[PDB]
Ligand binder design. Structure first.
Ligand SMILES: *[C@@H]1O[C@H](CO)[C@@H](O)[C@H](O)[C@H]1NC(C)=O
Lengths: 49, 49
């Protein structure tokens, strides 16, 4: 799924704690609201623990 | 208007517009002008009824 032409909102993404893994490779998640990107993609699949 | 499509990026809807689908042979009552431009890849629309 391609996400574009919208104001990014990761505030609800890191303020929650239901997730188990929040590792961000390449870029650091501490500054995400100050970074503007051209294309945002999102994959989704299920895998065992 | 086309046969098929494969992949693309942009899609816009804006506010709904209502026109009349009935065609006649009488004299015209409105004039519409449109200007399409492309500077640095930016598409420009200029119109006024
Ligand atoms: C769409 O697919 C074509 C392959 O025919 C590819 O060349 C093009 O880069 C793709 N467009 C995007 C935005 O990924």
């Amino acid at each position: 799924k391609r996400i574009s032409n919208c104001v990014a909102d990761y505030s609800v993404l890191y303020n929650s704690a239901s997730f188990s893994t929040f590792k961000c490779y390449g870029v650091s998640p501490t500054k995400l609201n100050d970074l503007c990107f051209t294309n945002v993609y999102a994959d989704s699949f299920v895998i065992r623990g | 208007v086309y046969s098929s499509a494969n992949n693309c990026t942009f899609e816009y809807v804006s506010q709904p517009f209502l026109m009349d689908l009935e065609g006649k042979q009488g004299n015209f009552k409105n004039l519409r002008e449109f200007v399409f431009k492309n500077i640095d890849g930016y598409f420009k629309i200029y119109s006024k009824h």
